What we know:
The PDB classes it as transcription. By secondary structure, the protein is mainly alpha-helical.
Amino acid sequence: NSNICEVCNKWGRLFCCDTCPRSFHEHCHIPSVEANKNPWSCIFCRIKTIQERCPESQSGHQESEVLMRQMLPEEQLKCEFLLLKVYCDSKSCFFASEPYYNREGSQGPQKPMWLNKVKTSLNEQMYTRVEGFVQDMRLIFHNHKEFYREDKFTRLGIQVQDIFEKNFRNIFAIQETS
Ligand SMILES: [Zn+2]
Ligand SMILES: [Zn+2]
Ligand SMILES: [Zn+2]
C-alpha cells in the first residue's frame, strides 16, 4: 500500500485498500472508511468493478439523460467518486468549508454552497437524481465567479470547475464531442 492518503497526499492514520495499493484517511475517503469489512475495497476499486460487470456502461451517454437518473446505489457511488476526485485537487481547499462574503463592490450569492455541504447532502441521501448533485457542484463555482468579478482569484473557480467537468465526463461516460 501507499504511505500517503490518496486524496490529500499527507501521512497519518491511514486505512489501506485490500484490492489496490491506495490508502486513505478516514474522512478523506467518500463514503467515510467503513468500521469493519475485511477485505475492504476503496471507491476506486468499486467503480472499476461496475465497469467490469457492464462493459457497455462505458459507451457514450448524453448529459441530459445522465442528469435525470435517479440516485440508485450505482449513481450514488458515481457521485461520491466524482466529489472525491474534486477533493483530490489541492485547490479544493478554497471551496471545502462554508464561505463568507464581505468585499467592497460585491454582494454574496443568494444560495451559498460548498463541498462539505455537498458531502453531507450525499451522506444523508438528500439528492433523488444525479441532477441535484451536479447542480449544487456547478453552483459552487458559479457563485465564486460572480462574487470575485474581475479579481484574478476568480480563476480558482475556473480551475476547480474544470477538474469537476473532466471527471464528470469520465465517470458518467459522457459522449465525446468537438
Ligand atoms: Zn487525506
Ligand atoms: Zn482500492
Ligand atoms: Zn452487462
